[PDB]
Design a protein around this nucleic acid. Structure first.
Ligand SMILES: Nc1nc2c(ncn2[C@@H]2O[C@H](COP(=O)(O)OP(=O)(O)OP(=O)(O)O)[C@@H](O)[C@H]2O)c(=O)[nH]1
Lengths: 1111, 48
DNA sequence: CCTGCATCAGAGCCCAAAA
DNA sequence: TATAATGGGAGTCTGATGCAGG
RNA sequence: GGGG
């Protein structure tokens, strides 16, 4: 069908590569494709250059190299291996005493490599590293809350690279310095820098009472060396103030370009703010034997000038996105790399003392264990390294562009308040105002705006078009927040004739504040409305019509859309759904021009102009982290002529290259018999019949056979006391055959384990003797099927020890994996949502004969209750339906861009053209207006919907332009007493499906210490009946019900055993006994040397252990 | 006022011990109790 | 006598919780 | 069981209460 | 990080 696009906005630049924030960050850190001599000092390179040379003997760093991966990406995922490259480093050993030089290339372990789409493979699982927002290093000045006329200057370096500093000015009048939460007079530190009373008086003095308050005579009564010793006694009480020891402490804390690192952004922000230029990233220097100041005096100078009200001095807003920067993958990994390198150096210095000061090379001197652990620690356990969200291609694309304020070096949950969670004015065009979690994390986790990119310093930049005179150039400038506030920025929709601003009054911003301005005053202009919102928000058509709280739900839920076998793109798109599939890397494109030689289910072979017969294998039914099927399908035919960049295969949840998160269904908006109540949804059985909303899902099962002190676990088809009916679908070896239907209780992999000293009790001995069957040496441990799961066995992997290429963790003979698939039809309790935030569970599936239908016999698909619209204020879904109605009959799909879209009149033109096909067909087919259509028209003119005094066709078209049609109830045949809104809507099936969530337990596993039921469905747990639930039972006064919850249904052991026996014998359950978790409480208080005594009414002790604990 | 206040707080601890029958030197441990083992278990998990 | 000032103990529920 | 070796490395915000101090 |  035809695709009609609305909107007048010409976007001068396309969206940037969307995963570039990941790819570019790590490529810059490793520089693997750069020749060593040409590397800039950044990332991995910078870490080596910082840690070396290592002093005593001197070990010096030459260069590093990265090898190729031992195994390819697919292979790593299979074998539970990390995708990584071997790292080597060339080191030269120098003897500071002798002259000796031994040089060798030492192996430092492996480093994980990033794939093409911006993710990692860590132990077989695909992972994402989330960027971290934090306060930029630099020098800031904030108002002191206590004294309304004074200020604090804070010098903050990069995280873990130095202390926080506070320069409060105390009530006594002297300027104080705060380091590691301890305070002293700042004048003392100034003298150590070699400052004299003259320098401070002549430099500053202009502020009469402030500069004199810093002056303290006792401090001046000593040369720079004595003042250094004096300060050290303040910071480290009890440590003897040896001159080399004091220098070492203060140097490492202040001047050392190893223990103190301002940022590269810190240097720029400091140089720019104080109007000085920094020679390095440290606050001071050690030069010609004494200390020479860099930062401290300019920072003191700015503070006094600010307190006095000198022009050009302002306080800094700490949530401004110019003073807040992003820490990307490379930077996070490099920080952990730097820690691991410094630890290895501890091993080097300590080994340069023990064992002979001569017979050592660099290869024996280096133990790489500290480095390997730090990198492995970061990737396998950091709280920024997350399990990839790959439910559908958009899930992972969004995951990679997220920004977290949490994690190692940032806010905690308990540690976080309003200023940080707010939407700052500088978020415009940089961080999406919509896409954030609802609940406790609101505002801490956000998403990168679509046109934003992170610069080399770590500040988020956004594009704007230059405007010279009144003419808008095509030159685009990416701006930081600090630089953006200088200019006057017009809105992207301001009218244009050609390249000229066509309005006499334009809508613009100056420092985020909205302002009306004449075309003479316009310096820049927005590139597009798209630049303000995240990628998910940009996928919501008619967004200009949706309340923000609901738009949020629309964004977040597209992440949760399950790939459907029949998946289709929405009939109303925003025009981004093409780009998302392409940047995600889910689909497949042609490298150069060529002709398709072969097309298969498994592969596509293309013959290019070059003559090379490139073969593209297709990924078929691979199981993602969330168990949705990632599978690619061929879109071309043998001999098809393709150009460069044309589609070859469609990925999951994509249709002919457009993002398909759901299906397009015909919807009626109307109550239906209370099956619509409070957001529930009623659907037509026609949807299951034609396999709409069916999705494939795969669950993975695994079992190990290991060596025990009692003998080997063996995976075998021979399992004690089981009938042949039970083993039928098992192969020779005890593994289920590929292509079998397995249901709950069925054996997947047979296994036997050797019986413990529980070697059968005499009760079992006599029973076994009666039947004349020896009690077997092994017991049945077979892997089976959990309650509620099962499907078709599609694959088996078996890995033993002593087979090529495989070695398991110690003690493990063999590992078997069984992949089981299921086709899931939509059912009652599965969850649906559209892009505007209407979400609900399927409560009823009616047979097609009950569904409301159009006069021409077509039944509707979904019935949504109108009560969900007005309080929610998400109207985009309404406009989406109307344009969807026209498209149903005209056979078209639309692109309506956000904020430059299809407007109401334009949709009306399209709706009228549809009516001709819905009606004109009928008038020609020899049918006139229906009797019931008149009855509804009667009711409609009482409503003011149609104008009185027109032919039925004239009135029906009037209703059709309001998006309403006559609807017949399939139960009665009578019309709905009014015209009903009907049209095509895009609705997705989300990841929350009852099959996954239904759970129940009679009795089951218990915890070790408490003897209470376990938690969670996978453990067959019991439900938690918590403090508030007990209150509920208490307020009702249901004491025996409550007592059951506290005893027989949990940790009362004598009672719960006895209660079960009663139910199976038909007796009533016994009165409960003492709960075991109370006995634990008693014994734990005894371990604290407290005597807890249960007493009777006579004040005599009562023994709740029934004699077992007393001698 | 302050003299009467502190003698009270002290007198409350004294009276606490007096009524209860507890000896103050019991706030000092000679024998340290050890909690039963099943309450601090060493268990073999699935993997051995 | 009274007031700064520190050290301490608080910060919702249930479910997945992908180790 | 024997050259001599002699002092360490490292990280929010609220309200209530019992304390050394103009 | 995700559901109400
Ligand atoms: N205590 C608590 N409740 C939650 C949480 N998450 C979701 N809820 C529930 O979510 C529900 C929100 O329901 P709403 O749909 O906003 O109810 P409403 O007032 O009718 O709002 P509308 O439906 O838009 O009219 C509440 O009833 C909560 O019990 C949570 O994290 N904590």
């Amino acid at each position: 069908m035809e695709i009609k696009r609305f909107g007048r906005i010409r976007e001068v630049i396309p969206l940037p590569p969307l995963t570039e924030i990941q790819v570019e960050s790590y490529r810059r850190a490793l520089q693997a494709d750069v020749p060593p001599e040409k590397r800039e000092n950044v990332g991995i390179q910078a870490a080596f250059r910082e840690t070396f040379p290592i002093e005593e003997l001197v070990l010096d760093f030459l260069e590093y190299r990265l090898g190729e991966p031992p195994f390819p990406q697919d292979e790593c995922r299979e074998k539970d291996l990390t995708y990584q490259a071997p790292l080597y480093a060339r080191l030269q050993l120098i003897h500071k005493d002798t002259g000796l030089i031994k040089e060798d290339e030492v192996f430092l372990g492996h480093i994980p490599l990033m794939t093409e789409d911006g993710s990692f493979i860590i132990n077989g699982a695909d992972r994402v590293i989330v960027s971290q927002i934090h306060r930029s290093p630099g020098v800031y000045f904030t108002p002191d809350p206590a004294r309304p006329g004074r200020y604090i200057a804070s010098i903050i370096p990069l995280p873990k690279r130095g202390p926080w500093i506070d320069l409060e000015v105390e009530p006594n009048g002297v300027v104080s310095m705060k380091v590691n939460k301890r305070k002293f007079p700042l004048v003392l530190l100034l003298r150590v820098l070699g400052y004299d009373q003259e320098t401070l008086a002549r430099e500053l003095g202009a502020y009469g009472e402030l500069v004199q308050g810093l002056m303290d005579e006792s401090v001046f009564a000593m040369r720079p060396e004595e003042a250094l010793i004096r300060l050290f006694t303040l910071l480290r009480p009890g440590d003897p103030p040896k001159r080399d020891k004091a220098v070492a402490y203060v140097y490492g804390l202040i001047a050392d370009p190893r223990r103190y690192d301002l940022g590269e952004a810190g240097r720029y922000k400091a140089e720019e703010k104080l109007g000085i230029r920094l020679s390095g990233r440290t606050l001071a220097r050690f030069e010609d034997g004494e200390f020479k100041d860099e930062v401290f005096l300019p920072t003191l100078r700015y503070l006094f000038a600010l307190t006095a009200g000198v022009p050009g001095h302002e306080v800094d807003d700490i949530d401004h996105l110019g003073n807040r920067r992003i820490r990307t993958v490379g930077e996070l990994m490099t920080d952990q790399f730097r820690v691991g390198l410094a630890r290895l150096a501890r091993g080097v210095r300590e080994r340069m003392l023990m064992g002979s000061e001569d017979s050592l090379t660099p290869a024996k001197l280096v133990n790489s264990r500290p480095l390997e652990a730090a990198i492995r620690e970061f990737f396998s356990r950091s709280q920024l390294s997350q399990f990839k969200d790959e439910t559908n291609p958009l899930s992972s694309l969004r995951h990679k562009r997220r920004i977290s304020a949490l994690g190692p070096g940032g806010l905690t949950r308990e540690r976080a308040g309003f200023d940080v969670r707010d939407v700052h004015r500088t978020h415009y065009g940089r961080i999406c105002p919509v896409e954030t979690p609802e609940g406790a994390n609101i505002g801490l986790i956000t998403s990168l705006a679509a046109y934003a990119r992170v610069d080399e310093l770590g500040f988020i930049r956004t594009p704007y078009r230059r405007v010279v005179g009144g003419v808008v150039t095509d030159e685009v400038v990416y701006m930081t927040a600090t630089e953006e506030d200088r200019y006057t920025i017009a809105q992207a929709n301001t009218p244009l004739e050609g390249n000229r601003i066509a309005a006499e009054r334009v809508v613009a911003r100056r420092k985020g504040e909205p302002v009306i301005v004449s075309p003479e005053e316009v310096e820049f202009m927005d590139v597009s409305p798209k630049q303000v919102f995240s990628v998910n928000t940009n996928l919501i058509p008619f967004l200009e019509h949706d309340d923000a709280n609901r738009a949020l739900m629309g964004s977040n839920m597209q992440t949760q859309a399950v790939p459907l076998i029949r998946a289709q793109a929405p009939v109303v798109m925003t025009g981004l759904e093409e780009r998302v599939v392409r940047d995600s890397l889910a689909a497949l494109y042609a490298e150069e021009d060529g002709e398709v030689a072969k097309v298969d289910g498994n592969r596509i072979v293309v013959r290019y102009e070059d003559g090379r017969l490139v073969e593209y294998p297709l990924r078929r039914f691979y199981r993602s982290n969330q168990g949705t099927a990632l599978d690619q399908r061929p879109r071309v035919v043998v001999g098809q002529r393709v150009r460069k960049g044309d589609l070859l295969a469609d990925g999951p949840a994509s249709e002919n290259g457009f993002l398909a998160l759901g299906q397009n269904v015909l919807v009626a908006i109307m109550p239906f018999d209370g099956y619509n109540f409070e957001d529930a949804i009623v659907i037509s059985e026609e949807l299951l019949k034609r396999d709409f909303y069916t999705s494939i899902h795969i669950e993975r099962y695994e079992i190990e056979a290991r060596d025990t002190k009692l003998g080997p676990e063996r995976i075998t088809r021979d399992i004690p006391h089981l009938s042949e009916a039970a083993l039928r679908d098992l192969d020779e070896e005890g593994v289920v055959r590929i292509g079998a239907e397995v249901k709950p209780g069925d054996i997947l992999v047979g296994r036997t384990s050797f019986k413990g000293e529980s070697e059968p009790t005499p009760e079992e001995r006599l029973l076994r003797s009666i039947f004349g069957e020896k009690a077997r040496d092994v017991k049945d441990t077979s892997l089976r099927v959990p309650p509620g799961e099962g499907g078709i066995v599609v694959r088996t992997v078996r890995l033993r020890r002593g087979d090529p290429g495989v070695e398991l963790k110690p003690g493990v003979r063999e590992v078997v994996r069984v992949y089981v698939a299921q086709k899931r039809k939509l059912q009652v309790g599965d969850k649906l949502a559209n892009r505007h935030g209407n979400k609900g569970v399927v409560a009823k599936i009616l047979p097609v004969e009950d569904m409301p239908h159009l006069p021409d016999g077509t039944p509707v698909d979904v019935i949504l209750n109108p009560l969900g619209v007005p309080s929610r204020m998400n109207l985009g879904q309404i406009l989406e339906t109307h344009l969807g109605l026209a498209g149903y009959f005209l056979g078209q799909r639309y692109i309506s861009p956000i904020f430059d879209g299809a407007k109401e009149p334009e949709i009306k033109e399209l709706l009228a053209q549809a009516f001709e096909v819905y009606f004109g067909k009928r008038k020609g087919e020899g049918f006139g207006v229906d009797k019931r259509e008149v009855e509804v028209l009667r009711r409609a003119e009482k409503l003011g919907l149609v104008t009185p005094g027109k032919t039925p066709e004239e009135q029906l078209k009037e209703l059709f332009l309001q998006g309403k049609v006559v609807l017949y109830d399939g139960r009665t045949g009578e019309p709905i007493e009014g015209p009903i809104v009907v049209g095509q809507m895009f609705i997705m099936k989300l990841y929350h499906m009852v099959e996954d969530k239904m759970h129940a337990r009679s009795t089951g596993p218990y915890s070790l210490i408490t003897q209470q039921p376990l938690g969670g469905k996978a453990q067959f747990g019991g439900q938690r009946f918590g403090e508030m639930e007990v209150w509920a039972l208490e307020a009702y006064g249901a004491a025996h019900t409550l007592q059951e919850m506290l005893t027989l249904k949990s940790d009362d052991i004598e009672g719960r055993n006895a209660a079960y026996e009663a139910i199976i014998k038909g007796e009533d359950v016994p009165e409960p006994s003492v709960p075991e978790s109370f006995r634990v409480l008693v014994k734990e208080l005894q371990a604290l040397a407290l005597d807890v005594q249960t007493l009777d009414e006579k004040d005599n002790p009562v023994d709740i252990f029934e004699g077992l604990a007393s001698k | 006022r302050a003299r009467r206040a502190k003698a009270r707080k002290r007198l409350e601890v004294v009276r606490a011990f007096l009524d209860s029958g507890n000896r103050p030197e019991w706030m000092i441990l000679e024998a340290v109790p050890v909690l039963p083992p099943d309450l601090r278990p060493m268990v073999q998990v699935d993997g051995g």
